């Protein structure tokens, strides 16, 4: 089980509402983390589409409409992007990332 | 550990077409490359929908997981989905037996293309 | 506005030695990390390494470390990843990107560079019929770049639009791919149909016999 688990495909109709899921292994506490979202469609480069730690920290990517949005399950260590208005340039590849901000230590290699 | 990693990600399909079986097609190996001592099995497979699908070859029954190389469902122009899938052997193995199969799998259906010498 | 541009596609040979670049335009380039993602054919995204031009404060993942080197020029505020030796494995495509105030989100990704190394030599196509005996194709094999283009043609100088082309494949070092015609039972009228096909390292026509 790695540290971040996405279902591999879904599947929804136009018009439509969907939620991709990553999950954070539980080894860690996803109410420390942010969830970031990127979009790739077939054949060109990543896009940042969002960032989401709650509903007063957040941040929408360069001209990421508003139908997509972020929100976390903290209780299920999840983090979510819904997109609604499913229209066929949603069509793509999406991959979730997650920084905790908080990251340190390392002074094992200066005493 | 987290920080710097990408899941593994999450390939979402928008449905805006009526389902369709693929037609499916099967090609043996051909001459100038059958004289040159060496095998190739063509498959191709267009004008599906949901552009969603599986092959798994099979060899008089049992199946071949030995140079078994497949592209992506393409999306064509008039917006159904394509695909190719080829399987490398030796004009001794491709007469030896006597079956080859194309079994294609899409949305429960499965679809089977055979061809022998 | 705010853009990362890389340089252009590569093709080499494994040993070979390489360097890409990644510029970036309207912004303070000095002032935000600069990383490096790569993507083999196929797969998903992989985190190489970061740096900060501001002062070139460099830092690589566990699987890169010794085996790429990031750089940055400040006055052309541009970037670099580079290999010593190049390796089959490292045929894959090359993004660059900026971090963000969330420092760990790639805001502005460049648009990409691609490298492939192979074994072999860049090298025109060869051509082939398909049939059995239903429709019939003819195929392209042992070529680099990825750079072809089908075309089709009666036994008579004809057009033909009843084709489609399908995706290249990546084996032994060189690419393949197909191209069918479909046509009316009711012939045998005929014999062969003609097969063209175009290369930068040079374009063949051939026939191609239907049952
Ligand atoms: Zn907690
Ligand atoms: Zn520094």
């Known amino acids: 089980q790695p540290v971040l688990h996405q279902?591999?495909?879904?599947?929804?109709?136009?018009?439509?509402?969907?939620?991709?899921?990553?999950?954070?292994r539980n080894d860690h506490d996803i109410g420390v983390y942010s969830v970031y979202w990127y979009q790739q469609r077939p054949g060109?480069?990543?896009?940042?589409?969002?960032?989401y730690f709650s509903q007063s920290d957040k941040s929408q990517g360069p001209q990421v409409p508003p139908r997509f949005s972020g929100s976390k399950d903290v209780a299920r260590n999840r983090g979510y992007l819904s997109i609604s208005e499913l229209?066929?340039?949603?069509?793509?590849?999406?991959?979730?990332?997650?920084?905790?901000?908080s990251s340190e230590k390392e002074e094992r290699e200066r005493e | 550990s987290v920080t710097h990693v990408f899941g593994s990600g999450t390939q979402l399909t928008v449905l805006s077409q009526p389902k369709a079986t693929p037609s499916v097609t099967l090609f043996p190996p051909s001459s100038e490359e059958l004289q040159a001592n060496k095998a190739?099995?063509?498959?191709?497979?267009?004008?599906?929908?949901?552009?969603?699908?599986?092959?798994?070859?099979?060899?008089?029954?049992?199946?071949?997981?030995?140079?078994?190389?497949?592209?992506?469902?393409?999306?064509?122009?008039?917006?159904?989905?394509?695909?190719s899938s080829y399987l490398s052997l030796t004009p001794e193995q491709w007469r030896s037996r006597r079956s080859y199969s194309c079994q294609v799998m899409h949305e429960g259906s499965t679809v089977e293309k055979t061809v022998a010498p | 506005e705010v853009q990362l541009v890389q340089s252009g596609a590569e093709v080499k040979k494994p040993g070979e030695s390489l360097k890409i670049s990644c510029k970036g335009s309207g912004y303070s380039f000095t002032s935000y990390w600069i990383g490096w993602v790569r993507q083999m054919p196929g797969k998903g995204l992989e985190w190489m390494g970061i740096i900060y031009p501001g002062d070139s404060?460099?830092?690589?993942?566990?699987?890169?470390?010794?085996?790429?080197?990031?750089?940055?020029?400040?006055?052309?505020?541009?970037?670099?990843?580079?290999?010593?030796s190049l390796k089959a494995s490292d045929t894959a495509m090359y993004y660059c990107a900026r971090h963000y105030y969330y420092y760990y989100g790639m805001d502005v990704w460049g648009q990409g560079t691609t490298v492939t190394?192979?074994?072999?030599?860049?090298?025109?196509?060869?051509?082939?019929?398909?049939?059995?005996?239903?429709?019939?194709?003819?195929?392209?094999?042992?070529?680099?770049?990825?750079?072809?283009?089908?075309?089709?043609?009666?036994?008579?100088?004809?057009?033909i639009s009843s084709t489609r082309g399908f995706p290249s494949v990546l084996r032994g070092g060189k690419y393949a791919?197909?191209?069918?015609?479909?046509?009316?039972?009711?012939?045998?009228?005929?014999?062969?149909?003609?097969?063209?096909?175009?290369?930068?390292?040079?374009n063949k026509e051939k026939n191609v016999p239907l049952p």
């Open chain 1, 7 to 24: 279902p591999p495909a879904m599947s929804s109709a136009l018009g439509t509402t969907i939620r991709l899921t990553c999950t954070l």
């Open chain 1, 44 to 51: 060109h480069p990543p896009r940042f589409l969002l960032r």
């Open chain 1, 87 to 101: 229209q066929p340039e949603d069509e793509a590849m999406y991959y979730c990332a997650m920084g905790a901000r």
């Open chain 2, 40 to 83: 190739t099995l063509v498959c191709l497979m267009n004008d599906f929908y949901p552009g969603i699908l599986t092959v798994t070859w099979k060899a008089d029954g049992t199946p071949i997981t030995q140079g078994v190389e497949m592209t992506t469902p393409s999306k064509q122009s008039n917006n159904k989905y394509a695909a």
């Open chain 3, 57 to 84: 404060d460099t830092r690589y993942s566990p699987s890169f470390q010794g085996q790429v080197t990031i750089s940055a020029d400040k006055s052309i505020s541009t970037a670099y990843l580079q290999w010593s």
């Open chain 3, 117 to 159: 190394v192979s074994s072999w030599s860049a090298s025109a196509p060869t051509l082939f019929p398909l049939v059995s005996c239903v429709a019939v194709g003819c195929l392209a094999q042992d070529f680099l770049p990825d750079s072809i283009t089908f075309s089709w043609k009666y036994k008579n100088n004809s057009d």
């Open chain 3, 177 to 202: 791919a197909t191209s069918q015609v479909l046509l009316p039972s009711k012939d045998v009228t005929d014999e062969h149909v003609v097969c063209k096909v175009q290369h930068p390292n040079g």
